[PDB]
Design a protein around this motif. Structure first.
Motif, mmCIF file in Angstrom:
data_model
loop_
_atom_site.group_PDB
_atom_site.id
_atom_site.type_symbol
_atom_site.label_atom_id
_atom_site.label_comp_id
_atom_site.label_asym_id
_atom_site.label_seq_id
_atom_site.Cartn_x
_atom_site.Cartn_y
_atom_site.Cartn_z
ATOM 1 N N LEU A 9 0.823 -1.208 0.000
ATOM 2 C CA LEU A 9 0.000 0.000 0.000
ATOM 3 C C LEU A 9 0.857 1.257 0.000
ATOM 4 O O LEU A 9 0.549 2.226 -0.706
ATOM 5 N N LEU A 10 1.926 1.268 0.801
ATOM 6 C CA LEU A 10 2.817 2.421 0.822
ATOM 7 C C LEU A 10 3.417 2.675 -0.552
ATOM 8 O O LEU A 10 3.551 3.828 -0.977
ATOM 9 N N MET A 11 3.771 1.614 -1.274
ATOM 10 C CA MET A 11 4.399 1.835 -2.569
ATOM 11 C C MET A 11 3.363 2.315 -3.578
ATOM 12 O O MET A 11 3.635 3.210 -4.386
ATOM 13 N N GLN A 12 2.160 1.740 -3.520
ATOM 14 C CA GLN A 12 1.079 2.172 -4.400
ATOM 15 C C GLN A 12 0.779 3.655 -4.215
ATOM 16 O O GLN A 12 0.618 4.392 -5.194
ATOM 17 N N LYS A 13 0.703 4.107 -2.963
ATOM 18 C CA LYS A 13 0.403 5.509 -2.691
ATOM 19 C C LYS A 13 1.574 6.411 -3.063
ATOM 20 O O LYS A 13 1.370 7.532 -3.547
ATOM 21 N N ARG A 14 2.806 5.950 -2.827
ATOM 22 C CA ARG A 14 3.981 6.740 -3.186
ATOM 23 C C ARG A 14 4.009 7.034 -4.678
ATOM 24 O O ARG A 14 4.248 8.171 -5.099
ATOM 25 N N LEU A 15 3.774 6.006 -5.495
ATOM 26 C CA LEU A 15 3.852 6.174 -6.941
ATOM 27 C C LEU A 15 2.651 6.945 -7.473
ATOM 28 O O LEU A 15 2.788 7.758 -8.395
ATOM 29 N N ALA A 16 1.464 6.699 -6.910
ATOM 30 C CA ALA A 16 0.298 7.497 -7.276
ATOM 31 C C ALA A 16 0.524 8.966 -6.945
ATOM 32 O O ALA A 16 0.174 9.852 -7.736
ATOM 33 N N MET A 17 1.119 9.241 -5.782
ATOM 34 C CA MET A 17 1.441 10.615 -5.409
ATOM 35 C C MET A 17 2.444 11.230 -6.378
ATOM 36 O O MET A 17 2.279 12.378 -6.806
ATOM 37 N N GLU A 18 3.489 10.475 -6.733
ATOM 38 C CA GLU A 18 4.512 10.983 -7.644
ATOM 39 C C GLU A 18 3.933 11.274 -9.022
ATOM 40 O O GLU A 18 4.254 12.302 -9.636
ATOM 41 N N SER A 19 3.091 10.373 -9.535
ATOM 42 C CA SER A 19 2.433 10.628 -10.814
ATOM 43 C C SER A 19 1.593 11.897 -10.754
ATOM 44 O O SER A 19 1.554 12.669 -11.720
ATOM 45 N N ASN A 20 0.921 12.137 -9.624
ATOM 46 C CA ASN A 20 0.108 13.344 -9.502
ATOM 47 C C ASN A 20 0.963 14.596 -9.378
ATOM 48 O O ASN A 20 0.557 15.663 -9.847
ATOM 49 N N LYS A 21 2.130 14.498 -8.736
ATOM 50 C CA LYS A 21 3.058 15.626 -8.721
ATOM 51 C C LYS A 21 3.471 16.003 -10.137
ATOM 52 O O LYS A 21 3.414 17.177 -10.525
ATOM 53 N N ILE A 22 3.892 15.008 -10.920
ATOM 54 C CA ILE A 22 4.285 15.231 -12.308
ATOM 55 C C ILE A 22 3.123 15.813 -13.100
ATOM 56 O O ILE A 22 3.295 16.750 -13.891
ATOM 57 N N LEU A 23 1.922 15.268 -12.897
ATOM 58 C CA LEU A 23 0.751 15.749 -13.619
ATOM 59 C C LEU A 23 0.481 17.217 -13.314
ATOM 60 O O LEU A 23 0.166 17.999 -14.220
ATOM 61 N N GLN A 24 0.612 17.616 -12.049
ATOM 62 C CA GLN A 24 0.393 19.014 -11.701
ATOM 63 C C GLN A 24 1.461 19.910 -12.313
ATOM 64 O O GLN A 24 1.153 21.004 -12.801
ATOM 65 N N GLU A 25 2.722 19.468 -12.301
ATOM 66 C CA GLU A 25 3.772 20.238 -12.959
ATOM 67 C C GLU A 25 3.471 20.415 -14.443
ATOM 68 O O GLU A 25 3.677 21.500 -15.001
#
Lengths: 7, 163, 163, 7
Positions: free
Chosen positions: B110-126
């Motif tokens: 779960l931690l890895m799933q959320k980490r990567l989902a968060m990172e994808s959303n950071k990139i998406l916002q940029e």
């Protein structure tokens, strides 16, 4: 091992 | 959290289960063995269950020999248990470590799933910030060109209005 | 805006040009004909030029016959002109209408170019407004998902920190 | 036509 008895 | 179970007509072969006295770190009377198809199995008793009362006799602080006497004292046994209270006493070291590994793996998945989902959303916002600034610049360029086009057309209209 | 021109050694064949008296709406002495290769042609006189002075004689209010006399009065003629002042007197109706059409077409070509450039920029700005709002919505969705992901990871970390 | 003289 624990103290055991078969019943 | 106690469950109460009833065994009737205890024969000569008996309950088909074994009790063990817990060690110093985990005291009590615990079911350590259950034969398949036995009376104890048919009524749902399981290895690791803690026996807390039999036929009104309190199984707390009771020594091993006395607990055996009570469980052999009648053909009808009403056994109160806390299910799985001593399950770890009858688990191998590898079984306990496998359980600990599995619980850690579930958290880590779960931690890895959320980490990567968060990172994808950071990139998406940029990416959104870049594209919205780029398109803001495109829009302002078009707006100021149109302001000049209007003034240029008004200048031609002045020439048009010479009759 | 006057130009001064010099013709020398006027022969028997003469200047090779003709003068006409302007009508009531456009009075004056105007060059109405110029023969190719003539002395008047060699010095740059053109049909439509207005003669305003010859050899010090003022050609304003001068009648036709007197203007002819002055232009035949010497073998050296100093002719002051306003170029093309009466060009429309010697233009056909079709030539004048063709000129008016061409001037209008030039204005209309620019007006249409600016109109369509303006319209394309209007559309472009509308497209930028749509896309920037769409991407703003994408960004805010990603941001609030990440706020939840952070709280979900912190909740798992609480479980991780049970030793 | 205008009053015209060839020179």
């Amino acid at each position: 091992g624990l103290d055991t008895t078969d019943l | 959290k106690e469950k109460k179970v009833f065994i009737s007509l205890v024969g000569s072969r008996g309950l088909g289960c074994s009790i063990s006295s817990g060690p110093i770190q985990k005291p009590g009377i615990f079911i350590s063995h259950v034969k398949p198809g036995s009376l104890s199995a048919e009524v749902g008793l399981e290895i690791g269950d803690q026996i807390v009362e039999v036929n009104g006799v309190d199984f707390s602080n009771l020594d091993h020999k006395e607990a055996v006497n009570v469980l052999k004292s009648s053909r009808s046994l009403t056994i109160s248990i806390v299910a799985a209270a001593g399950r770890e006493l009858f688990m191998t070291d590898r079984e306990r470590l496998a359980e600990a590994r599995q619980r850690e793996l579930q958290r880590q998945e779960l931690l890895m799933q959320k980490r990567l989902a968060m990172e994808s959303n950071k990139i998406l916002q940029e990416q959104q910030e870049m594209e919205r600034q780029r398109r803001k610049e495109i829009a302002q360029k078009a707006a100021e060109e149109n302001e000049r086009y209007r003034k240029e057309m008004e200048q031609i209209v002045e020439e048009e209005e010479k009759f």
